[PDB]
Antibody, heavy 212, light 213 residues
Framework: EVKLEESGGGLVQPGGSMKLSCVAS????????MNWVRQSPEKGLEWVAE??????????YYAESVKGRFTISSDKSKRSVYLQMNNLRAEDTGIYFC?????????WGQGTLVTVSSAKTTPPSVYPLAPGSMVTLGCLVKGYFPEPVTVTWNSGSLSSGVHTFPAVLQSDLYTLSSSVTVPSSTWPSETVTCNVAHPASSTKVDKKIVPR | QAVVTQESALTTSPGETVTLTCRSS?????????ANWVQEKPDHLFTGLIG???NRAPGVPARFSGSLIGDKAALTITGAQTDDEAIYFC?????????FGGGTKLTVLGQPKSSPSVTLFPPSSEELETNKATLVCTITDFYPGVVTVDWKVDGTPVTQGMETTQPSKQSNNKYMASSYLTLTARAWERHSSYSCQVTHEGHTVEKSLSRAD
């Protein structure tokens, strides 16, 4: 099976540089063109660049807005395609995907998030959401930067009834919530705890939800 | 520099035909623009559907076809299914660069209507220690994925300090959203009743809390 996996995304300052990697496996992709496409809320999908994966030689094409700022390259020996980004701007913020193209966009990676900002890396505050057949409990993950966070419940052993909502953004701080529904007979008599990770600040928090 | 534009939203039902279009600001779309169509499903699951205007990728169901209709590129679903509820992007080639359109949200009314489950949470005492108060209104298991959220404090509409997320797909293909009412801790103590009102398909579901509980 074909596998594409992006990496290298994170916070980076305006004017700064950042190298993304795309590692591909499955079969010989010489007929394909590796494309970088970024997703923002504003633009939707936006084309960045591509490179022919021919072994004989390469050909590259670039979006007007990245010309002279970004270079695309590939190392066949590492089964990798790279996007070197430089002189980064706020508009470069987004999820960067590599995709193998031949006539159509055949295979896609899971993406890597690039945040172009000079704002402070802020770990989350994690607050319990308790009620003031079944009962809905929650987890407020307030005031972190940059994205993302991850939320689990009882270390993933509570998976059914779990909804994690999109973050909102205010004053360079994100906030999201996660809810879980469990039987009224099982809470509070069995403990329910959310587990939040914020990779950017190497943060992990566990918050037990108690009645109040 | 060409701007590629698409319908922002269309609705169809199972078994019906629907056509999405894709305009180029530079003029008529031609086969020289080698129109591509990409489907985005939730959690960034992308599928290439069409390349070179009308060439369907292997694995893509026969009900999808690409074409040029008038001066535009077009994607047609002849016999739409519930699983086709997704975002569809077109991309046009201009000799040495690709340009994506803004995408079309296709709604396919295959699922039964589902009213939102609403839950309103008060501020945590831990948060109140920071002199801040956030009420969280969770909204789940609704279909179709459109809601209006209104807040009240002490029976009065709030026009300030509110933040609602766009509906996003749940794993079960219903929709969820969350809304936040942000107050100072003191504001929280100067008011008694708080209400989150979710309107969905003309029908309102209200949840409220009283500081007396």
């Amino acid at each position: 099976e074909v596998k594409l996996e992006e990496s290298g995304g994170g916070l980076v300052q305006p004017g700064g540089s950042m190298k993304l990697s795309c590692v591909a496996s499955g079969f010989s992709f010489t007929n394909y063109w590796m494309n970088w496409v970024r997703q923002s809320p504003e633009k939707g999908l936006e084309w960045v660049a591509e490179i022919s994966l021919k072994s004989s030689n390469y050909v590259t094409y670039y979006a007007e807005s990245v010309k002279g700022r970004f270079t695309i390259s590939s190392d066949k020996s590492k089964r990798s395609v790279y996007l070197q980004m430089n002189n980064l701007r706020a508009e470069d913020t987004g999820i960067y995907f590599c995709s193998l193209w031949q006539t159509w966009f055949a295979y896609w990676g899971q993406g890597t998030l690039v945040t172009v900002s000079s704002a402070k890396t802020t770990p989350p505050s994690v607050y319990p959401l308790a009620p003031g057949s079944m009962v809905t409990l929650g987890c407020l993950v307030k005031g972190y930067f940059p994205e993302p966070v991850t939320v689990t419940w009882n270390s993933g052993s509570l998976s059914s009834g779990v909804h994690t909502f999109p973050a909102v953004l205010q004053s360079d701080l994100y906030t999201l919530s996660s809810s879980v529904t469990v039987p009224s007979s099982t809470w509070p008599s069995e403990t329910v705890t959310c587990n939040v990770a914020h990779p950017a600040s190497s943060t992990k928090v566990d918050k037990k939800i108690v009645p109040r | 520099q060409a701007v590629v534009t698409q319908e922002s939203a269309l609705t169809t039902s199972p078994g019906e035909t629907v056509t999405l279009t894709c305009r180029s600001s530079t003029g008529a779309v031609t086969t020289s623009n080698y129109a591509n169509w990409v489907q985005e499903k939730p959690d960034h699951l992308f599928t290439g559907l069409i390349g070179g205007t009308n060439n369907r990728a292997p694995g893509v169901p026969a009900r999808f076809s690409g074409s040029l209709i008038g001066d535009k590129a077009a994607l047609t679903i002849t016999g739409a299914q519930t699983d086709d509820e997704a975002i569809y992007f077109c991309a046009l080639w201009y000799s040495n660069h690709l340009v994506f359109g803004g995408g079309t949200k296709l709604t396919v009314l295959g699922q039964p209507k589902s009213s939102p489950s609403v839950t309103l949470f008060p501020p945590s005492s831990e948060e109140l220690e920071t002199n801040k108060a956030t009420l969280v209104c969770t909204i789940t298991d609704f279909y179709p994925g459109v809601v209006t959220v209104d807040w009240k404090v002490d029976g009065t509409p709030v026009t300030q300090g509110m933040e609602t997320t766009q509906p996003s797909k749940q794993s079960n293909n219903k929709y969820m959203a969350s809304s936040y009412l942000t107050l100072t801790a003191r504001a929280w103590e100067r008011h008694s009743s708080y209400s989150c009102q979710v309107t969905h398909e003309g029908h309102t579901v209200e949840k409220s809390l009283s500081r007396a509980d």
